[PDB]
Amino acid sequence: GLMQFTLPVRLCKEIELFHFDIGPFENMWPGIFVYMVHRSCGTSCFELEKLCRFIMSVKKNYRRVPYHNWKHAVTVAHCMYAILQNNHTLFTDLERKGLLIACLCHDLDHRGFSNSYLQKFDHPLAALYSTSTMEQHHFSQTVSILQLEGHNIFSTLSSSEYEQVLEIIRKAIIATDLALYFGNRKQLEEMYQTGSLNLNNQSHRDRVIGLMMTACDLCSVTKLWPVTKLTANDIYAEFWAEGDEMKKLGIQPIPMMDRDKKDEVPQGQLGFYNAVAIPCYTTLTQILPPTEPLLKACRDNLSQWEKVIRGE
Ligand SMILES: CN(C)C(=O)c1c(C2CN(c3cc(C(=O)NCC(N)=S)c4ccccc4n3)C2)nc2ccc(F)cn12
Ligand SMILES: [Mg+2]
Ligand SMILES: [Zn+2]
């Protein structure tokens, strides 16, 4: 059935925008990802039969969680598509394929619990993955979905180019760990200021890819305000679910995960934009000038949060 899907013509223009909202097209999300893979890398790059199989299995391996779900993976995948569609000459064929696959798989089998929750309560995956717990799980889930019969869509190419596209995918998926983003963006800033950024250096591309992953992961702040406000409700309902599960253990959660501190949500959002969101899209816009509309939309949403704080 996914092979049969062809996207409506009225959305070919809209999806190319950075602030495009996949929200009201739930039935199309799998076909929207196919469309994006078909425009960024072309049809006949993957064998269509195995690609749709790989996609539909990835959706099934996403849990019915409030925010870190299937809607989130496609949203992140789309933002990567818009970034690659506006920087087309800079990323190789193996990169455009791998990064769009990475984003659709970057939160595979997430349970709605932070990396801290799993480490603080000795979850089995925290034993396996001591640091970047969920992100190592997501990559392992990706590899396992790939290695299924009829699912390996990079089987079509070199055993070297195969291992290359995987460590592109692992690096990208690991980079979605927000804790690693701060050290990543700081080193890119030094490389930018000192004029030391060489995109012909593998270590530098890897840093820049990671920032793109963060920008895509946070791209909920790059939508129009009505879209951004309602995605925030999903984010907090998942945080508050982890907090509820902490209050049931005699441990008070942080205010971010505390539903009884709903009133502090606008102040917390403004702090997040200034400490995290703005620095991310600012450095990405400095490195990739075409990606400036992300920073512009993020600024408009900061103003909106300010006006909620002021009652304005
Ligand atoms: C992983 N993930 C979803 C995020 O990280 C996140 C948040 C968090 C930060 N925030 C807070 C954070 C705080 C706080 O304690 N400090 C503020 C900072 N300056 S971090 C807070 C305090 C009281 C009440 C609510 C609070 N909500 C939710 N929002 C977004 C938006 C888009 C996005 F793509 C991602 N996110
Ligand atoms: Mg992740
Ligand atoms: Zn994510």
From Swiss-Prot:
A divalent metal cation 1 binds at residues 72, 106-107, 217. 3',5'-cyclic AMP binds at residues 68, 269. 3',5'-cyclic GMP binds at residues 68, 269. The active site is at residue 68. It is linked to Dyskinesia, limb and orofacial, infantile-onset: An autosomal recessive, early-onset hyperkinetic movement disorder characterized by axial hypotonia, dyskinesia of the limbs and trunk, orofacial dyskinesia, drooling, and dysarthria. The severity of the hyperkinesis is variable. Striatal degeneration, autosomal dominant 2: An autosomal dominant disorder characterized by striatal degeneration and dysfunction of basal ganglia, resulting in hyperkinesis. Homodimer. Belongs to the cyclic nucleotide phosphodiesterase family. This is cAMP and cAMP-inhibited cGMP 3',5'-cyclic phosphodiesterase 10A. It comes from Homo sapiens (Human). The chain holds residues 724 to 1035 of 1055 of the full protein.
